[PDB]
Design a protein around this ligand. Structure first.
Ligand SMILES: CCn1cc(C(=O)NCc2ccc(F)cc2)cn1
Ligand SMILES: CCn1cc(C(=O)NCc2ccc(F)cc2)cn1
Ligand SMILES: [Zn+2]
Ligand SMILES: [Zn+2]
Ligand SMILES: [Zn+2]
Ligand SMILES: [Zn+2]
Lengths: 360, 360
């Protein structure tokens, strides 16, 4: 059976399970069950399922080299699908809540969930809570007797936490750290001293890389009972590297990809985000360019945003991007080679993850 | 050592642990660690700690009748405190998010967290996420080798989920169920058909009782390795009963307790909440009273709210409250007696929980 059709069938099975359990154990009525079904579909479906399919892909790689009964192969693949859906649902939780937090308008060419007329922020915040709770309901139901349950829950938990910490790093990235204070409304930075590569790296490493690359890889390993076939420090290093490159690409697209292709109108400039573009621009600009950057960044005024975009163009950031890209290719290939020592199979799965990221 | 001082010392220990772990493993800087410390204090401290002290109280009861080494007694009490703080932190998560969801202004005579000038909704939503993540970080750190870890995590998980489901029941309680639809903005009910005792019961049972009474009781049992000393169906029944009475009292106070004593200006009437008052009023009103209720309920206009309050006064709901109260005393005393068969000690802890609720 092809991997994606297996993955999507398991969504239907997991959906039915969660809703059936709401009716039998949580006293839900048909109308609220229908709302939750619609919310699940709208928030969990319609992306590429890269995260969840990674779990499946890693597991398939091991199946090709490991002896098992057919019923075991099916059980491992089912497990990988369930684990993949845990990660998709975790992502859906963070996208719902992040869209609310950020006042976002669109996501994948449709309105953000909270903006649906029959939702509202009041419900949406809670809907995003439920999305994450479902991850745990899935785990406890499908993996109850599994030897990996402990390690899976502990990992999931650490990744979730890392993500929320990353969210904090991101939403506070345009404030001066020394002025953070719950009692005092936060001014935007005037000096931009904290727009550095290392500070940027910390934002991206926590906010995206742990749940986008680390978790799918290591979950694939746990449902395969294969974690002792890898050097876990390598898996972390390669995850964080590829995840960083992914976020840089996202940052560049926010500014330069036409909205109809982006699925939204990008506002990182108006939001004064610590983006790869802003940090790389500041690492090469002259005094007058920095000054003009500071006069225009982090302002809704479209004239000011057009000025920032122009500054980035004239600064030939495309060439810094190619140079970053080249270095990432070196490092990711080096880590892939190192992973071949203990597992050629796992190494190949990381190669596939890298190709899918590097091309898109 | 007195229970409350033990409980509060453990807050300091758990705080230090979480922040120290942010620095050593999550790359946090001192300023963000200070924000998170302030957020933790502001959202977790300053209530009565009834929930968390219940875990401690149940555990102390068992210690008085069970043979242990002194180091075991200390370890059990430490565990009960940690488990109590998990529940306080879970509550803090739900109060942060609920205040945002509801546009609340105050909580315990201070501004809601999101309203602090240096917070904002953008941060606060995520801060509430972090509050719940800390529950799991505590559990995995302090209970890693404990035999109860599995059952504690699974229980916690089910309670959290029940709570979020309850939140949904509550925020949708003034809509007609058959019209729930994410695509269509939701009108307030005109008939109030769904303001019934059974529907009310479902709201309160999920939104409050599982995390306020069930979880503290059963966590006290799990850290005591005492769950097989009770009939778990009785513990559930008594939890849900006492929790329902707690919520009724809360509902009555929302309307009739002066704000300075309430710690907030109550808005259940303007918010069209399915309260105990609205449901009991509708179960005794005549046709003209129902009509006047419908013309005035769920409207910000202070004249209309004063009309609703007057309708409740004239309707002598205080007498229905006394009659409800009497029935709850019968039933809770009956359940307490039933709990005495397998555990007099646990029965006495439930009695204490009941007294603390019944008086306040
Ligand atoms: C051009 C060659 N090169 C650039 C770097 C670099 O570290 N850029 C800064 C940066 C920090 C964090 C990120 F996530 C992405 C990028 C390394 N080699
Ligand atoms: C007056 C004697 N009495 C009232 C009831 C009753 O069920 N009231 C409705 C109600 C439903 C749910 C709740 F949580 C609280 C209250 C039972 N005996
Ligand atoms: Zn965001
Ligand atoms: Zn972006
Ligand atoms: Zn609420
Ligand atoms: Zn209330």
């Amino acid at each position: 059976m092809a991997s994606m059709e297996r993955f999507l069938s398991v969504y239907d099975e997991v959906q039915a399970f969660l809703l059936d359990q709401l009716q039998s154990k949580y006293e839900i009525d048909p109308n609220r069950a229908r709302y939750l079904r619609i919310m699940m579909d709208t928030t969990c479906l319609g992306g590429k399922y890269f995260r969840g399919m990674t779990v499946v892909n890693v597991a398939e790689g091991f199946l090709a080299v490991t002896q098992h009964d057919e019923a075991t192969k099916e059980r491992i693949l089912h497990d990988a699908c369930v684990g993949g859906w845990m990660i998709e649902f975790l992502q859906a939780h963070y996208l719902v809540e992040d869209d609310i937090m950020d006042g976002s308008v669109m996501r994948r060419g449709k309105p953000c969930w909270y903006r649906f007329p029959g939702v509202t922020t009041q419900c949406a915040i809670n809907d995003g809570i439920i999305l994450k709770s479902w991850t745990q309901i899935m785990a406890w139901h499908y993996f109850a007797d599994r030897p990996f349950l402990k390690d899976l829950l502990c990992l999931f938990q650490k990744v979730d936490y890392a993500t929320a910490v990353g969210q904090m790093y991101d939403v506070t990235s345009m404030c001066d750290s020394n002025k953070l204070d719950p009692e005092v409304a936060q001014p935007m930075t005037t000096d931009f001293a904290e727009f550095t590569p290392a500070i940027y790296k910390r934002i991206v490493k926590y906010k995206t890389t742990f749940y986008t690359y680390l978790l799918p890889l290591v979950m694939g390993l746990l449902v395969s009972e294969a974690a002792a076939s890898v050097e876990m420090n390598l898996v972390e290093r390669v995850a964080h590297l590829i995840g960083e490159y992914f976020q840089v690409q996202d940052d560049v697209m926010d500014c330069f990809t036409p909205p109809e292709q982006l699925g939204k109108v990008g506002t990182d400039i108006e939001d004064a985000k610590c983006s790869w573009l802003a940090v790389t621009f500041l690492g090469k600009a002259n005094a007058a360019q920095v000054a003009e950057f500071k006069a225009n960044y982090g302002e809704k005024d479209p004239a000011k945003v057009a000025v920032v975009k122009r500054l980035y163009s004239k600064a030939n950031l495309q060439a810094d991007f190619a140079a970053y890209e080249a270095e990432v290719v070196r490092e990711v290939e080096s880590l892939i080679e190192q992973l071949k020592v203990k597992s050629p199979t796992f190494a190949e799965s990381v190669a596939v993850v890298w190709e899918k990221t590097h091309k898109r």
